[PDB]
Amino acid sequence: HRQKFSKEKKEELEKLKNEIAEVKAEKEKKASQLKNELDNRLKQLERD
Amino acid sequence: ELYQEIKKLQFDRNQENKEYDNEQKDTNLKIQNLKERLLYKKARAQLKNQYKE
Incomplete structure (x- = not known):
């Protein structure tokens, strides 16, 4: 749980x-x- | 020996669950805060560019 969720959130934070x-x-x-x-x-407009 | 290691293992499980919940909540909060910071930076960028327009 720690590893999966932490990598998910680190990648999301890098995205952000x-x-x-x-x-x-x-x-x-x-x-x-x-x-x-x-x-x-x-x-x-000036040249005009 | 087995009982003592079982006790230490149980306490390790308890603490580790504590840190799992803590890290999960904290990193979700950080993702939310990064999204909100992106929101505000987009807001300032777009408003300043609109006034440039």
């Missing part, structure tokens, strides 16, 4: 940690993408 790290990565990636969207919109 990787998800959280990728979630922060998504935070920053969305930041960059949305700032780029804003800049492209502004520059195209």
Whole structure:
């Protein structure tokens, strides 16, 4: 019981940690993408 | 000799069951807490990115 349940939960926790790290990565990636969207919109409108 | 080892073995069983329950509960709690931390990080990420949008 100890070994099976502990390995199950350790793998689940590693899953959760990787998800959280990728979630922060998504935070920053969305930041960059949305700032780029804003800049492209502004520059195209400026050239217009 | 056999009775004494039986007694020690019984006590080992009792304690080990204690630690089994403890570890099971604790690691389930840790899984829940990791899921909740992922939830909050997703919340901040998505909200900050929405305001970037």
